[PDB]
């Protein structure tokens, strides 16, 4: 019904033990089994791939490669195509198309705090330089240094029909429920954090753009069904509870350093972060791995 | 299941023309309109009752006066009965007990700031200062100027049996999600903020210290009942969404300014509120109206 | 050039060592030994003093005793009468002009968060239950949970001639140094914050409500007198420096728990605090400890 | 006294009428203007300069350029070198030190949110790449999302020798103290903020990074005479308090929106910002120009 799907998975983006090189072989067989353990989409080269350590080449490959390890299957390849240069977004954005990817994240942009108007102008210039490339909006304050209004978002949601869906993750119930009350059904709400997804789930939203999919996808969409089909809030918040520790400690250190931890302890050679971002502590660490246990990963 | 219930009304206090003096007629005649209106439960002079210019002697009064109203009904009556000092507390408590109220309501001290342990030898000496009494914390950083952790209410329900709810108004889901998972079932957790209540209801809550439910108590009910019991989150949103614009016109200038706005507008004379508190201006009147109208409340 | 001068010394209050009475006799040396130890100013029973766990009665007697124990100085005693019911301080206020003190220090509404003419409105009526008895408004968003803007302040030292000086402890600088430009220069404005004297005083601000001014009160005079009076910002800066891990120190919990630890520490029998402030923790008595020996004060 | 000065520039960066290109004539004039006009120093595609929308090639030109326009003058040429990646940021440092510019400013990771480990990290292999070129960090949490500490702050100063300066915009006083007194005093401490200067100079501070210095830096530099050399405070808060007005108006919009507008409005053809910075609004620029009256610039 959305065509993004309920659960979209933020993948890592491997690389070999230096750190200088994309490992596109982990990339292609780590997607693969994605698709088979509940991502209805993936998203290539955004913040948990590490995307601002990435160069455009590396994120054009990524998404050939990633596309490729996907076909057969309904698992939809967004790419992470968005920047706070509104000309370096465009450029990504046709490259998408001329690849043939189904969807672009674009977030929006960080450092420079461009006024509202200024989103909007970013969005729309974007939007109409692939106008037939479905589109996902991503807001979160915390990292970009503004925040997306209600009225804005909506607005974009009226004026370009790509643009079909909204990652939040300003954690604001009153500018999300807002957003979602103003916007057609057939307009996709989705949570951009693994802990506000029951909740952002009460005010009308059809999912999450997930960290924790990579280990607990096919448990996440147990939870939505519980509680958007068969009427078990009790349930959805079992569940939600079973992995409370895992979504803490997946964030005690900054995404993806303790993402790319439980990775490699599961046996997927995913490599290093690299600079600016450092090594899980041995603190983290030990804290990611009980959650692990307890959580029945190892 | 629970002993306050799913809804919980924080009463405004009515005052004379001057504000010089409460209406208890007015009191009595409104608490016993929202017991049959969806009210399980009725808060006393607290917050929204403008428990900061009433004195002690009010407040006593208040509580018999409203007790009276509701008898008759399974409505349980809660004694506003916090402060930021111990010693009052603990002997408004010990009024409240003697009186036979159904409980107490008790903030987290306000402007003195107290060390978590302070926080918890603060309500430890509370409950212990009426041990069968049932007690409701209410944690609300905003006013205050600290907050109540999740390790403190955890422990809190554990030590003092008493200890029965938890009205939680930070709006700090996190916090609101681990108090559930590690307090037993029969602790109820409630949203001190009607703008949460839905999101809280995902999070475990078992319902909503209100404001609106002066208003729309009934409605407020039905929204948790098509949630927790019937399995139509569709419908409980629906509901939401309709009252958003009156839950946002209601804070437009400070509680209780709207609340008892919107009673005089309904024919309730509830009168001004007192100093520091100032009368609505126009601009939020209109706003306040608007909302109303659409909501049904009015013309 | 200001009535209440460039240091005002925020007093504990001391109390016997169960904490059910005050100690009027160790407030009275405690006071006697702040007029001659750079207290141009001394307030009675604010937050520092414990305000909210004392009674009224308590208060006033703390006033008088406070009163005598500094007649024959210039040492001027501010009661600490402020409220969030303008009511009740209206009637601390009177109280405090019959009895002759200097001056008021009033706080503005905690916890009830008025709306900006509501704070207006508050303090006109305090100022005008007594005309004649200078006043000092007291801006704490911080323990309030609300901000008296730069406008509202502004106002009100023009409408009000007794409203003679502000204590600002929002930590704004932008609201500061408006204030500070618009009002007349007769009109105080005071640090709230001992950390914030120096960077205060480089917009205009004519000293400090302190709490450290109980142990080193002459070197923060020293330190306001090398800044205004003799054009030396880099041995001001000196003095902030020596002191800037006891004024760390002496907020490491909440405000007067570490106060009152370092008082008992010197030989000051200043008694325990009230419920809910509980004793200081073994680790910030140590870095309480460690800071004072280093800064010259004990051992 | 110190190497960069008391007044350092944030040169706004000029483009022609379409926004496509940089105006290098107009960038050479402007920074000759500054040299002559209070400008110790001058920050080359910066923040204040639309670093975001510019890509390396204009920076490296803007610093060939702008070095040249100030030669024959004590004026010293900072190149805004900083990234969120690491790579990306001694890329730009070794291409500095090419060029012959006297330092670089170094912005703390924006975006990714690193680790204060990460962060030293960042800094320390920047510093190693070029270990003769002078370097200014530049901690703006309200932007990157993120906040360099004291700790973090000084072990960089004691570590690494050609780390001289930080431009500190928390508005943390605190942090700003702790700094000042555990670094030598060879180290500068600069405000990133023109309404913070007067008081961060109380708490040790050597000056500021400024945008209004395009406007008034002789008044700037004369506030800073009378409080560090003259020991006249009044007068440097009287000279504070004359510019309030313009401190505020520069930043009602996010900057450098209306540092472009108040170059335009005295003649200096800066041209317009790029997306995602739209125009400023007629009820910001109203604003501006009054203040810009009443201070004597119009
Ligand atoms: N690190 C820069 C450019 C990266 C573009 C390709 N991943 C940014 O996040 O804006
Ligand atoms: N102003 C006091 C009044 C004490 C009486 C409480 N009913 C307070 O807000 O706590
Ligand atoms: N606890 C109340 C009453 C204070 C009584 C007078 N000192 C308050 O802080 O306002
Ligand atoms: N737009 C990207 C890269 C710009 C590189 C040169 N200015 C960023 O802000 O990180
Ligand atoms: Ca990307
Ligand atoms: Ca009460
Ligand atoms: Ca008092
Ligand atoms: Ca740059």
Sequence with gaps: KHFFGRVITALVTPFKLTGVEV??????????????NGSDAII????????????????YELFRVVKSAVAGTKCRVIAGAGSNSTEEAIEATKKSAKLGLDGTLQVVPY?????????????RAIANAAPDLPMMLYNIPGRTGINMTAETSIKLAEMCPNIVALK???????????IRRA???????????????????????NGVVSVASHFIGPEIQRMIEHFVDLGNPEEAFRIHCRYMDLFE???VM?????????????????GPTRLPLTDITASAEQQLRQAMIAAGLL
Tied chains: 1, 4.
């Design 23 to 36: 490992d596109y072989g982990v990339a292609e067989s780590l997607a693969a089994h994605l698709a088979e």
């Design 44 to 59: 290539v080269a955004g913040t948990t791939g590490e995307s601002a350590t990435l160069t455009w080449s590396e994120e």
């Design 168 to 178: 939040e993750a300003s954690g604001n119930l009153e500018q999300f429920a807002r």
């Design 111 to 123: 450092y420079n705090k461009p006024p509202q108007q200024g989103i909007m102008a970013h969005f």
């Design 254 to 270: 900054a995404n993806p350093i303790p993402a790319k931890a439980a990775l490699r302890l599961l046996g997927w050679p995913v």
């Design 249 to 251: 400690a997946l964030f």
């Design 183 to 205: 916007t057609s059904p057939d307009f996709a709400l989705y949570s951009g954090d693994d802990a506000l997804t029951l909740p952002l789930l009460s005010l009308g939203g």
